[PDB]
Amino acid sequence: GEKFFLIHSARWLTTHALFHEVAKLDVVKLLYNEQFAVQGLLRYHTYARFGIEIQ
Amino acid sequence: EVKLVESGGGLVKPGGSLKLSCAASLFTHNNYGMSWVRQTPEKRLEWVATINSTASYTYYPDSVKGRFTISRDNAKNTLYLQMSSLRSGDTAIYYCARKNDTFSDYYFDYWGQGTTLTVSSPKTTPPSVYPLAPAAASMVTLGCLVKGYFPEPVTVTWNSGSLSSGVHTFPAVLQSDLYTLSSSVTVPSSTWPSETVTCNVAHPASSTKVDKKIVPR
Amino acid sequence: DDSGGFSTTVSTEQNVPDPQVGITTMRMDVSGVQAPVGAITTIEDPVLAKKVPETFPELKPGESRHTSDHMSIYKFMGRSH
Amino acid sequence: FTTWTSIPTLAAQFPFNASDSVGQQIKVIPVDPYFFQMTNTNPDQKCITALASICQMFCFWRGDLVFDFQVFPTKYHSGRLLFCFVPGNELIDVTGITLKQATTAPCAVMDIAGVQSTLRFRVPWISDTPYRVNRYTKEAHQKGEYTAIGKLIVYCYNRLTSPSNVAHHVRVNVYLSAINLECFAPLYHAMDVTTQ
Amino acid sequence: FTTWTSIPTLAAQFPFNASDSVGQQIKVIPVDPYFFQMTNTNPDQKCITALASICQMFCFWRGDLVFDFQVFPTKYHSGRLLFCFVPGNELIDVTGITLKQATTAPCAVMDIAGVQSTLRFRVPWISDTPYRVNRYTKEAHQKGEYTAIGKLIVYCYNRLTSPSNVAHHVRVNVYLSAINLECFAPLYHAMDVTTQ
Amino acid sequence: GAYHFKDPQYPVWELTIRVWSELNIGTGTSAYTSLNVLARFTDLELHGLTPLS
Amino acid sequence: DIVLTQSPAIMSASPGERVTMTCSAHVSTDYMHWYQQKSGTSPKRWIYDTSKLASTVPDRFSGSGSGTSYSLTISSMEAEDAATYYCQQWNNNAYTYGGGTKLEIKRADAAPTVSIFPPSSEQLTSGGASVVCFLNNFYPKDINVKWKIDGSERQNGVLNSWTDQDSKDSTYSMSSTLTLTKDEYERHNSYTCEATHKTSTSPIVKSFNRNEC
């Protein structure tokens, strides 16, 4: 359950202006996917309470 | 630098078969899934093949399923593409493509030079090249008219590469089972009619060489 | 540790709720003789971000005159709107 | 409310070009918690600091302000800046002060390169009245009531010497926060961007 | 014999170009002490590791392997790699694994710049049989007997950002050693270069 | 009380990345750099297993 | 699966202005990856993810969009973009391509130069003929070339050839071939191809007689 997952990437250029938004993502929704190993527990349960680590 | 060298190709009648080979080097093949990209001259593009590391998984779209056969050789570090039940919809240019991963999706990096496949049933025909003569200024245009060839690649070069900067190579038009183009060259007024102006015509399929010297009418 | 992991670099507690009483009161030089270590810093370290700055010789302001404090929510928003 | 005011937010923005002489004035700052100048286009909005959206609801304010200058250099530039504080009010004639004349006022220097990149600058309280009024609700001026304790000047104390394969300017962000702050006498007023 | 096996020798070699996308697979490694691919021309010889010239004389082997990756950068490049270990055997279909799909497997990242340049990577023992057989004497395959505990993948986790007056690739050597190793049932066999 | 996976109300967290200062290069320096985001749970607690897929 | 579209077909632009094209699908795609096909060679790395230009691409290009609409933002048009772009979707299996946006560099208006040649004698003894009209160094590409055959116009047998933009003078050139027979050639006298220009008012009448020489 608790293991670092690569969920999304972006790329930062020279042509982006000031205050431009590079990446806009939903943290919880991208974790819920079959390609990760945490799907095997969340698929059969209903409610959850949790905290988030970001790197 | 990644090197993808295609091979094979030619004139295949419909209802035949042909095997190709993209033999790459300088990089390890067992990190890379390979594929094939089709270039129809009218509409672009369409993607037809997929095989991963081992020779187990083969992914086709709906159309080419049951028609094509792909197999990798990791010992000789090559590729293959066995095509069956060919018809005129696959008259095209074929690239070998390399798969790589992005985050949620895939991505190509390098495509090779490509071969030429043409599916129709006439015979291989050598061309018939005839000059283009005027009936006056500081610039005088001349040209060679190339007509009557079914194999598509032809080489029209002026004096084996001397007048190369003033060339207007016009593309070919398929007309009554015959392709026809006309390369027109820009010649100064002091060269013609005082020097030699002759275009090269190289037809590699029939191995014919016809040199036509432009004469004044 | 609850998760059984490991960490040597720390991102500390951020935005401490209710840090200071908003009346100017006392709990002698505040700043002075000692060389200012708070004059220069690095803002990207959350450990070193909470150090009290000083650059000039100062001292204690004093005490206000009005009794109650006007910087608390329960006395600010006690007024109707 | 001190949970909002004691946290620094971005207020201003200015570059440091490589083509300035020693003693050229780069940026002037009136010293008040009402100062902010950033804005955005998508969506159309005038940005605000956290300190300005607390003190915009009070008639009077008092306390020391903390300016935080953050540079963004490479490892290979060099130069020195001179921050200077002139006591007074929001309107004096301040650009006649020469570089040598600025050393009479309290000042401090900053070195660009190194392993630190933030200068916390605590401004003392210098005034003749105990509380300094809010005037931006009114429209006309009046001698005696003001909004500032003086202004701040950013000089060029040493020039920017650099190699060829790096850039030619270093941008500096300006933060804003307060300490020992006190306000009273509530009201309602929406601020506007001080265009300096 | 552990005087030879516990000393790391060079096994493989691969470059890290500046023209790769994020998620491109650079090099795959089957996990076994029988792996080696270096060779020389003068004189004509196929090089060997010290670990391969001990375990080539036994029917069975067991224990954790230690991969050591050594980079050779300048001080001015930057980027991150992602080493991933997939449990299994020497033949599975492994290049369909996307970069996000590799985080399910146990993995680790590496930063290029710094004062360290060596990542010691200890592979755990994941198998269904206590001992894993030597098969390279035989010629045909058979489902159930294998030579590996899985394979390893080297991804590109962040790209190579660099200045102009440095090179555009960083070469990485791959070492090979073992710990807690055990072999028995002797024989004679000369290995051959695994051409990956 | 808790999050509902198969029918979310509204997303709990929303990460954002803004350009805080612009990227400047010279001549021949590469004009890009990659980015990555890593994530994991802490203190996962589950309730009420359902049979439906 | 699902097919992509590209809203312009051929867009022209002067050096120093903005160029914007749009790729769109009818089923929402996550990441869009673009390609650049130069004339005669293969496509290469142009755009990996939603907004991530390749290694050898200059900084002025960009990409954006999410879901249905996707754009390719060019801030400054330059002289090196004479090629064809392609968008590609990358969900479940098919990885279908775009329609193809041919980006050409706009040049100012110029008059067409005409030099029409009668067919050679070796073709006239082969049973056929090819009355071919030339055009050189003209703008725009879309030009109306009609034949004047004894005061009338015949649309049967017209073969028009078209090159791309030359990388040096940025001009266009044309062939216009009228396919005929040996004895059908010997009925008319007046042979004229005229090029209808849009800034020049009348089409330039360039003529010759068959019964000359």
Side-chain angles (χ1 to χ4, degrees), chain A residues 8-11 13-16, chain G residues 31 48 51-54 59:
Chain A
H8 181 76
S9 294
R11 198 183 77 188
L13 296 172
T14 62
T15 63
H16 295 289
Chain G
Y31 290 165
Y48 66 105
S51 176
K52 294 181 183 182
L53 280 70
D59 294 328

Side-chain angles (χ1 to χ4, degrees), chain B residues 42-216:
Chain B
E42 183 178 0
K43 63 184 180 293
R44 286 177 184 178
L45 306 171
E46 190 170 359
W47 180 65
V48 296
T50 293
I51 183 165
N52 292 318
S53 66
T54 57
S56 68
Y57 291 167
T58 61
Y59 294 161
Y60 290 161
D62 198 6
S63 66
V64 303
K65 182 174 71 67
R67 296 186 294 172
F68 291 162
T69 301
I70 194 165
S71 293
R72 289 181 66 183
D73 193 2
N74 291 318
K76 292 181 181 180
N77 290 318
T78 59
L79 293 174
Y80 293 99
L81 184 63
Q82 295 177 356
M83 296 182 285
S84 66
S85 296
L86 293 174
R87 62 179 62 91
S88 179
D90 291 329
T91 298
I93 292 169
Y94 291 157
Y95 292 107
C96 60
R98 185 178 72 180
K99 284 191 175 189
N100 284 316
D101 301 332
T102 60
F103 296 98
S104 71
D105 291 331
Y106 290 170
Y107 184 62
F108 295 117
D109 284 330
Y110 294 99
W111 295 353
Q113 291 87 20
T115 60
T116 300
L117 182 61
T118 300
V119 182
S120 179
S121 65
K123 301 294 187 290
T124 299
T125 304
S128 295
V129 180
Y130 290 153
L132 294 173
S138 179
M139 179 180 72
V140 175
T141 305
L142 293 174
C144 290
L145 179 63
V146 180
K147 183 177 173 65
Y149 63 96
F150 182 72
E152 180 70 28
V154 70
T155 299
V156 178
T157 309
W158 292 94
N159 297 114
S160 296
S162 178
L163 294 173
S164 65
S165 66
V167 180
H168 296 285
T169 300
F170 294 156
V173 174
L174 181 62
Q175 183 61 254
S176 179
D177 204 1
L178 296 175
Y179 292 95
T180 300
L181 60 86
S182 66
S183 179
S184 65
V185 68
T186 298
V187 179
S189 295
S190 66
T191 299
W192 184 72
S194 67
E195 292 179 353
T196 299
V197 176
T198 300
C199 61
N200 192 5
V201 174
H203 187 272
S206 65
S207 296
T208 59
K209 291 181 181 179
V210 176
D211 291 331
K212 299 299 290 182
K213 184 175 174 65
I214 293 96
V215 296

Side-chain angles (χ1 to χ4, degrees), chain E residues 99-119:
Chain E
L99 184 63
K100 288 184 179 182
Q101 295 180 357
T103 60
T104 300
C107 65
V109 298
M110 183 178 178
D111 188 75
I112 294 299
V115 298
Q116 290 84 17
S117 66
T118 303
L119 188 143

